[PDB]
Design a protein around this ligand. Sequence first.
Ligand SMILES: Nc1ccc2c(c1)c(-c1ccccc1)[n+](CCCCCCc1cn(CCNc3c4c(nc5ccccc35)CCCC4)nn1)c1cc(N)ccc21
Ligand SMILES: Nc1ccc2c(c1)c(-c1ccccc1)[n+](CCCCCCc1cn(CCNc3c4c(nc5ccccc35)CCCC4)nn1)c1cc(N)ccc21
Lengths: 536, 532
Amino acid sequence: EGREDPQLLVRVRGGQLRGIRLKAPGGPVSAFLGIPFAEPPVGSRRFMPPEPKRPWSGVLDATTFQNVCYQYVDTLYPGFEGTEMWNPNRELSEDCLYLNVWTPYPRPASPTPVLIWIYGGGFYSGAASLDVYDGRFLAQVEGAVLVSMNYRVGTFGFLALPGSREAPGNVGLLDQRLALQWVQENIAAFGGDPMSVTLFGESAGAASVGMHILSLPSRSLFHRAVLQSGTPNGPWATVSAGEARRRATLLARLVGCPPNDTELIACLRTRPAQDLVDHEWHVLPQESIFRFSFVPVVDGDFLSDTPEALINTGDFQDLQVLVGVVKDEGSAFLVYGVPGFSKDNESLISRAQFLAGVRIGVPQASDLAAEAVVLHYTDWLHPEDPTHLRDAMSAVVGDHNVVCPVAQLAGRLAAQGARVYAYIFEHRASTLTWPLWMGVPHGYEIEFIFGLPLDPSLNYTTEERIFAQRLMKYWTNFARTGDPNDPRDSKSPQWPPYTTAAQQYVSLNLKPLEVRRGLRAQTCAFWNRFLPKLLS
Amino acid sequence: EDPQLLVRVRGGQLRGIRLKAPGGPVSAFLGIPFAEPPVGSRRFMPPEPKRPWSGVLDATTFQNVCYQYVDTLYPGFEGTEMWNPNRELSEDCLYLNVWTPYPRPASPTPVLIWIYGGGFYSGAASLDVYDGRFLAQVEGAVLVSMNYRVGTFGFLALPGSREAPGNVGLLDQRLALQWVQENIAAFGGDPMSVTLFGESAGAASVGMHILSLPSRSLFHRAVLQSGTPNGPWATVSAGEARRRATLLARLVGCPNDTELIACLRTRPAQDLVDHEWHVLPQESIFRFSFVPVVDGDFLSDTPEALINTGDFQDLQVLVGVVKDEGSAFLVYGVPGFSKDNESLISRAQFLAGVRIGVPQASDLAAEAVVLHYTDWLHPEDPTHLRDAMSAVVGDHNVVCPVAQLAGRLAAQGARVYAYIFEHRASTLTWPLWMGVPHGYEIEFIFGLPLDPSLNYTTEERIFAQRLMKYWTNFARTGDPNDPRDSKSPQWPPYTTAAQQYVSLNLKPLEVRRGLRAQTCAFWNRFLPKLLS
Ligand SMILES: Nc1ccc2c(c1)c(-c1ccccc1)[n+](CCCCCCc1cn(CCNc3c4c(nc5ccccc35)CCCC4)nn1)c1cc(N)ccc21
Ligand SMILES: Nc1ccc2c(c1)c(-c1ccccc1)[n+](CCCCCCc1cn(CCNc3c4c(nc5ccccc35)CCCC4)nn1)c1cc(N)ccc21
């Protein structure tokens, strides 16, 4: 240091860091990007839990995002903003276990509440460097400290041969936990309050947040949680030890590693990263959508039991949670598998195409259950309307994978001590490039919660700017206090907790808050109470 | 002697009685024999035509009510007794009543033939609510109604036997229908324009006549109010009918078909009635011991099958339901339900009543019903659970079978008009929570509110006049709409595409779509897959 900016030099337990002074619309912020929190999980260390990062010497440059964990890059629609905005924005490498911190500039006087973001991507994709996860607006506007970490995805993160030592499973979650430990020891260097850490995340990230709520060593690492369009319970976020075993073994076969677990994992470790990616979809048991090959396994360790059992019997008094869904959870999933669906036409389907989709949307379902789904979603006045069928198929996927799982997470949590706040996000970005029929797709609240509309250069409407400010007040009010409502405010409609008695939740859109009752109450009774029994 | 009151039917001469109706005199011919009394050796057998008589037969009063169980759940209560026999009980009961205008119509008039209900165990054409005078006087109709055997006497079957072949109560009705063809002309009635109408078990009978080829040449149009030949209660199979008869016979100490039937014939009628309730296979409501049987004769195949494959092109049908088909049945065996309180039930009591209301339901199937009918916002609210139990019973037994029948007839070329009846009679003595219970549209169709001595409101007098117009317009032309009155709005036909039906209430007609579609899809399409 000679002439460096005094506000950008900070020490953490691993050594010295140099951050960068970033411009936000309303002023500067400090970012420390690419801070290593683990030893690169490379070589003999692929599939293994992560080890703490060994201290370095000199000043580590933390001015730019680090590598993205090895993943499948989407190619369904080349050039298309709608998919590319989720694609990796840095080089892919197994050396990817880094985290990012944004804090006010100058760093705040007294300790600030900390928000830790966990990206989604079905446990097979995503990076904390994506433009929609930019911590600068929350940091600058709400005075918050914001952290996001990379964690291994796909085979690299979740390939398990359960009961073995060399590939125990759940190591992606263990990267996330390591980063939470890192925040406990280090966040105070940045002015963050380690005693007020809220986890938030979306899709698979939300599932992860809930898995930290259900895993005891994670509990002392955070104090509150927000789950956006995802849950640990439900059909896609976990697998039995058996199923994960079948998958690893199948993948092994596929890459030339025939099966003892040591021989097998070793052979997999000699395989090139890309080979594993190039083969990971092939191990899924059925033609299906909203199913991912390598996901958290119920190992009897990180997850002592299935998320369903753990939410049915855990005590949560104790715990404050904000949960919700977007209007159209299913729609955008339809174009990755259901015949008849495309982003480039209005996706009007036949009744045949619907029955056919239901079997892919609900792959575990017998003929009888498939009929039950179809019968429940048919509009009997117009059982042939292409437009209604299209919307039903979207609803089936949304309801089965997100809405109804969230619906019970909120149900069981509230009944067992938790203060729960629930929402449905109903605003379609004016700037969306997916077709109008898709409505408000899975993923499209994120840019509003992070404050992107406030970037004048991004072409959001004025209404949208104000809407994002509101939502940022909601999230950080929740982080700061466990109540998304503003104490200094006077109704200005209140966000009431979700209870089992009242089942209250709010609409999030451009209009002031509207309180509604019951998240798809009838329809979720179908998925959560009836359907299970049509497997039993 | 009044020449108007003298008629020559094929069996000989009759004397009727001139009755007083609000707006003018009507001629009535009550208690006309149409069959040989089905007594002694004729018990359980097809009726035979009545033998000619000498002189002038006195047809001025109602005849005996066919032998049946008499209700005593609430002795003295108008709400139950109004359905009870209002004449002496006898196996000698095959008589019919005719009302016509006075004077006898100048030209041939449309004929309505009423078939009463009462679960094939009860009923009589003589009940005040089936009084044909108002329709006769006001709409100029010729209205006929017949007694038919009920319970063991009408429906005890040992299928395949010569002696007790089953469905004889149906054959009674058919004999009455044949009697109308041969004789009604003499009363100024038009035999080429006969409309059958009937409610509850009466409705299923009409349904059965639609589905039986010999009955088809005896009428031209049909009205089924709150009942259908398909559904869980209106038919039994040959195997099950035989089981019940056999069991009943055992129960009265009757030890080969011929032998068994001979002994049953030697039995006082009240013995058979004493033991009829005891042959039902389960604790249940809306199931009746002795009902028509799928015989391969009168019914060539199950109604479900018959409606499925039949050709119903030139056929006009009027079908409908009341708002609260299920409520009144709940007090007849579902724990927690009483007429003398608001009947608010617990969830446990709901699951329990579902097993009684849907006696065939497996553990999983009942939970399906329970899960579909719960208010998930509500979901332990006693008012709801009570209403839902009423809804389960109505839907399962009437509404959804109606919806199913309306659907197949329309699809197969019939012309269908449908309604839901939503007005609760002001005179009703059943509790408010029962709403508009099974059976309580009849007084309106028959025009009873027009009798000022009955204390109906003025609104009701006007309402009943409208219904009388709908039904008799329907009888005259196959279309219930007033064919010279403009602005209405019009009662549109039921079609499978649009599914249009109307509400009959104090307000002017309102057209709705789907009766009552999500729920009937449940009953008609899902539940059956949960049996097989
Ligand atoms: N031919 C191949 C080869 C390999 C794979 C294939 C296909 C596919 C696939 C592509 C098109 C059609 C069918 C199948 N896939 C993709 C199937 C699953 C894709 C789901 C895409 C999706 C759609 N949405 C909703 C819309 N919003 C998002 C997305 C995406 N990511 C995110 C991340 C967080 C929140 C939202 C969001 C990415 C894509 C587009 C929209 N989320 N995720 C692969 C997947 C693997 N794990 C491994 C290999 C391959
Ligand atoms: N211990 C015994 C012995 C014999 C019988 C018993 C009980 C009962 C019974 C009474 C009370 C509670 C449980 C059982 N029952 C009664 C079971 C059948 C009761 C049906 C009641 C009912 C209710 N509704 C709806 C309301 N409106 C009506 C009625 C009644 N009839 C009609 C006829 C046409 C249209 C409407 C209508 C008669 C009763 C009350 C209301 N219709 N029918 C008997 C029946 C048999 N088939 C044979 C024997 C006996």
